[PDB]
Design a protein around this ligand. Structure first.
Ligand SMILES: Cc1cn([C@H]2C[C@H](O)[C@@H](COP(=O)(O)OP(=O)(O)OP(=O)(O)O)O2)c(=O)[nH]c1=O
Ligand SMILES: [Mg+2]
Ligand SMILES: [Mg+2]
Ligand SMILES: [Mg+2]
Ligand SMILES: [Mg+2]
Lengths: 414, 554
DNA sequence: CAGTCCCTGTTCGAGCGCCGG
DNA sequence: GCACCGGCGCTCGAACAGGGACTGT
């Protein structure tokens, strides 16, 4: 709806997104057609022809505590292509405070963008296409007229108005922290579990009051905490046990350079049978516990660098357990952690992977204000086929796939 | 009649001008036959005569049409296509008859002179200038530019399809129950109306299309049960493919094996059992398309086996959304799979084939899994849903696989079908080291400058063995040493290596491979009873590993 | 110890064909 | 001496990555 739009540039050297629309299920094409026919009548999107060379895929998800479908667009590409606009020109400050909070509620304030108009010279970049079941008709192309939900540039433009709406609430609640990441609003407090819930209720009202709708849940930062690398505690040690132990230690030495293995290798002199029991020597016993000591106190010299990318590797541990590590430069981890099976959901390794992905990303937003690039333990096709069945987030992070077997039953396990 | 629809605004890539390429000399038959096409279009206003103010030129030619008699004017815009702005292709795929639902009345129409009935952007008409040379080249030939959509330009299909959708948008509003499968100018219009009342909407649709410039000549399938649409023959109950003639010849060139695999693949759509892997092996080693290649023995068998599937009529039934979708998979040969999507026992919808060899070292399970995926993906494309699978694998085989594998894996709702050859895991390495089994420490090195190498083992009991190797690599030698440790051992072995690479291959439990060395290491592991494989860090003081390292150094 | 070579494994797009228009 | 666009298959080569050796000051 008309006022004054902001001139949005693309970096001279980069071209707009040109991504192919992947296949969608009937249940969700129908959903998209309805949402799009609605959104067009309202004037949010417009029909375009093939002379617009750009595309960005669309789909639909079904959020938790919702039976209504949500139109999600995979803007990942356009974001990479407009990062000077959203990171440099119009940055959104990240508070180091919500990490230190007790409870943080996330709010889907994405609805607010549909009021603000998008620059004409940019509407072209936000083009998408709905497919048709069994290719009855060619795809129906559309483009945004308003700010899009999924673009990292929408909150950037809305900052102006968002800070105004939020100021009277902040003036009387200076102790409460509000961070904005895309369609979401992270709101944290050092208050009581019950009093938090009502301040959130007041905030909802405050926004609903300023014209913005917002249709235990909430995150507990300090209830996550970094889990260490740990060595087993055997009563008696075998040849095999010592070798597996030496392996763990050898890779671990790439993280903590002070770990010595010498005396453990001294116990392994000559070709012994794998199940022969070797008792521990005086110095071997000292090196065991001394190495364990270095794995008790985490690696020093781990500083976030806001220009460098966040990287995350996940490991499938089996029986519903999944471990993760986030770093920027290898062996120098910023955060490490587990991921347990949620109560009531059916066992599907992909649901678990996607769930894990979303958790870690949320943590990464809350902690750093950025999303990580994921090194996923799954084959490309397997993921590309079922990830959208379990997705419930408004953002989508970067990912690559990796096949790497567990040589040393992953430093992370039992 | 040319369409009164608004033009799609076209631009040329920034800083580039239009084509100034000369017309090549043509055949007298073709030139004479192209003057008729151009005279017909001028009087109909489809092209326009241009004077000395148009510096552009592009060559034209003509191809014969599918049913002959009439020509097709083509323009070699390979040059303008380069200087023209990119488009976004609106055609996302080819419609499949297995996706069509059972209709009471059908009529498939084709729109004659399709592209030559849609306006071209008034501003862009200049670069679409061509030249028809005279009968014997006297003075200049007639010039001409386009006022309509040219056959051979990058922008043409996307603009036409898009222009066809805007044409059928008003008619569909007034007729929601009518299914118009539109692919270019080929409209399969199908309804649940009675034959008399159906034929009336078709005349309303015909008249609608003629108000829009789009003519439908009297070569529109009326009510003729053998409807030829999209390379198929559609009967009211069932559909089949159009006649597929596979050519028999004594000597074959590489261009022919390409043509045969492509034909065979097309026919995989509904003829179950098609195999191409051995025929496809003849395209290996690049070579010329003109060069003759001899048909090997295993490929002669396959072409004969495929010839046998083809001389039999097979049909596929249409879709019933009130009934659910079933997909079934069979193992063919090595790395080859066939599936079939049905709703009822002998009544198939579509059949298929999965033969991709992704990776150097895979297994049946891994392959069955990517087969399941290929279907799921294309099922969502045709019916908008995923099917229930009937798979040749045990619930317990699958369970041992996924719970033990390091990648995340999943196959949808499926049921075990007891149809041999079954998909199984041929071995399973031990979680813990075998007590009462000999421990084999293995390593194997190679000199990268002389291409020579050694590979061997040393055991706890005192057993030892090193072997010289000819044209090896450092990785092959470490693989050779696992092979040795497996030959010279009992039913129960314990092998300990310092190679990530090798162990990595074996941990993934391969049952096939591109490498013969790896193939026989598998053959050996299957022959065993209990095998425990483990890893150790290279240049550390691991007594056992250290001993073999020295031995393989010279 | 660091670059550097080789091996081996990937992923992408190109090229050819098939079918459709 | 020959156009376009789409989907699929199949092979090849480019580009890239990781590990183990090598070499070198
Ligand atoms: C098969 C084919 C189609 N096309 C496009 C352009 C045609 O206008 C359109 C439809 O092709 P056809 O319908 O096969 O040809 P047409 O409609 O122009 O004329 P008619 O009905 O008289 O056969 O498809 C090409 O550009 N080249 C081709 O070789
Ligand atoms: Mg036609
Ligand atoms: Mg046609
Ligand atoms: Mg060695
Ligand atoms: Mg060595």
């Amino acid at each position: 709806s008309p006022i004054e739009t902001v001139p949005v540039k693309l970096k001279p050297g980069m071209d707009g997104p040109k991504v192919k629309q992947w296949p969608l299920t009937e249940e969700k094409i129908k959903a998209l057609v309805e949402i799009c026919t609605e959104m067009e009548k309202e004037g949010k999107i417009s029909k375009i022809g093939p002379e617009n060379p750009y595309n960005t895929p669309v789909f639909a998800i079904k959020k938790k505590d919702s039976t209504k479908w949500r139109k999600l667009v995979d803007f990942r590409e356009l974001n990479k292509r407009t990062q000077d606009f959203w990171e440099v020109q119009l940055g959104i400050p990240h508070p180091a405070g919500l990490k230190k909070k007790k409870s943080v509620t996330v709010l889907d304030v994405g609805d607010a963008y549909f009021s603000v108009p998008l620059d004409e010279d940019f509407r072209k970049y936000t083009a998408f296409t709905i497919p048709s079941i069994n290719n009855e008709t060619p795809g129906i192309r559309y483009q945004y007229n308003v700010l899009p939900q999924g673009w990292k540039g929408s909150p950037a433009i809305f900052q102006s108005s968002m800070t105004k709406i939020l100021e009277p609430f902040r003036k009387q609640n200076p102790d409460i922290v509000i961070y904005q990441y895309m369609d979401d609003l992270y709101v944290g407090s050092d208050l009581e579990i019950g009093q938090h819930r009502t301040k959130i209720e007041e905030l909802r009202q405050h926004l609903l009051r300023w014209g913005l709708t917002t249709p235990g849940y909430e995150l507990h930062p300090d209830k996550w905490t970094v889990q260490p690398i740990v060595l087993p505690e055997k009563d008696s040690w075998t040849v095999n046990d010592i070798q597996k132990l030496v392996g763990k230690l050898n890779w671990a030495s790439q993280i903590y350079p002070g770990i010595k293995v010498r005396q453990l290798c001294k116990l392994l002199r000559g070709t012994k049978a794998l199940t022969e029991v070797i008792p521990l020597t005086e110095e071997a016993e000292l090196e065991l516990a001394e190495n364990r000591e270095i794995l008790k106190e985490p690696v020093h010299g781990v500083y976030y660098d806001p220009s460098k990318d966040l990287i995350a590797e996940i490991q499938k541990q089996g029986q519903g357990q999944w471990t993760y590590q986030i770093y920027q430069e290898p062996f120098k981890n910023l955060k490490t952690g587990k991921y347990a099976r949620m109560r009531g959901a059916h066992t599907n390794d992909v649901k678990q992977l996607t769930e894990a992905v979303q958790k870690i990303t949320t943590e990464s937003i809350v902690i750093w204000g950025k999303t990580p690039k994921f090194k996923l333990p799954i084959q490309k096709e397997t993921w590309e086929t079922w990830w959208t069945e379990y997705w419930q987030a408004t953002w989508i992070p970067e990912w690559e796939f990796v096949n790497t077997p567990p040589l040393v039953k992953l430093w992370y396990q039992l | 009649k040319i369409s009164p629809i608004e033009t799609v605004p076209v631009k040329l890539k920034p800083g580039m001008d239009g084509p100034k390429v000369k017309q090549w000399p043509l055949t007298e038959e073709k030139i004479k036959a192209l003057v008729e096409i151009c005279t017909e279009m001028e009087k109909e206003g489809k092209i326009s005569k241009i004077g000395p103010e148009n510096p552009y030129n592009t060559p034209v030619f003509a191809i014969k049409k599918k049913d002959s008699t009439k020509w097709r004017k083509l323009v070699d815009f390979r040059e303008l296509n380069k200087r023209t702005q990119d488009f976004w292709e609106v055609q996302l795929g080819i419609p499949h008859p297995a996706g069509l639902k059972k209709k009471k009345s059908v009529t498939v129409l084709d729109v004659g002179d399709a592209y030559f009935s849609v306006p071209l952007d008034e501003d862009f008409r200049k670069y679409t200038a061509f030249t028809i040379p005279s009968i014997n080249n006297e003075t200049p030939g007639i010039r001409y530019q386009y006022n309509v959509l040219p056959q051979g330009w990058k922008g043409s299909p996307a603009i036409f399809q898009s222009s066809m959708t805007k044409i059928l948008e008003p008619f569909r509003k007034q007729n929601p129950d009518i299914v118009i499968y539109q692919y270019m100018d080929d409209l399969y219009v199908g309804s649940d109306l009675e034959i008399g009342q159906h034929r009336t909407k078709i005349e309303e649709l015909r008249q609608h299309l003629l108000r829009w410039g789009l003519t439908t000549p009297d070569k529109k399938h009326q009510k003729e049960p053998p409807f030829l649409w999209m390379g198929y023959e559609l009967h009211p109950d069932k559909w089949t493919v159009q006649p597929i003639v596979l050519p028999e010849k004594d000597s074959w060139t590489v261009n022919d094996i390409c043509k045969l695999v492509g034909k065979l693949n097309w026919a995989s759509q509904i003829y179950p059992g098609i195999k191409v892997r051995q025929l496809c092996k003849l395209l290996r080693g690049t070579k010329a398309l003109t060069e003759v290649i001899p048909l090997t023995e295993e490929a002669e068998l396959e072409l004969a086996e495929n010839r046998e599937i083809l001389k039999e009529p097979v049909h596929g039934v249409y879709y019933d959304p009130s009934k659910d979708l079933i997909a079934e998979i069979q193992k063919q040969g090595q790395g080859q799979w066939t599936y079939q999507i049905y709703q009822e026992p002998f009544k198939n919808l579509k059949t298929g084939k999965y033969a991709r060899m992704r990776g150097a070292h895979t297994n049946d399970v891994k392959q069955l899994t990517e087969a399941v995926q290929k279907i799921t993906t294309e099922s969502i494309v045709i019916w908008g849903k995923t099917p229930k699978f009937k798979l040749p694998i045990q619930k317990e085989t699958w369970e041992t696989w996924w719970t033990e594998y390091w990648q995340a894996t999943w196959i949808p709702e499926w049921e075990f079908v007891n149809t041999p050859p079954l998909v199984k895991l041929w071995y399973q390495l031990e979680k813990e080291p075998i007590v009462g089994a000999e421990t084999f420490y293995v390593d194997g090195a190679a000199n990268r400058e002389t291409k020579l190498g050694k590979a061997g083992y040393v055991t706890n009991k005192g057993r030892q063995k090193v072997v010289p190797l000819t044209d090896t690599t450092n990785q092959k030698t470490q693989l050779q040493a696992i092979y040795l440790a497996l030959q010279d051992s009992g039913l129960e072995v314990n092998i300990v290596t310092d190679s990530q690479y090798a162990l990595g291959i074996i941990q993934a439990q391969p049952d096939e491979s591109e490498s013969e060395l790896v193939n026989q290491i598998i053959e050996q592991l299957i022959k065993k009873e209990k095998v425990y494989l483990a890893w150790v860090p290279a240049h550390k003081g691991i007594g056992g590993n250290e001993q073999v390292d020295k031995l393989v150094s010279a």
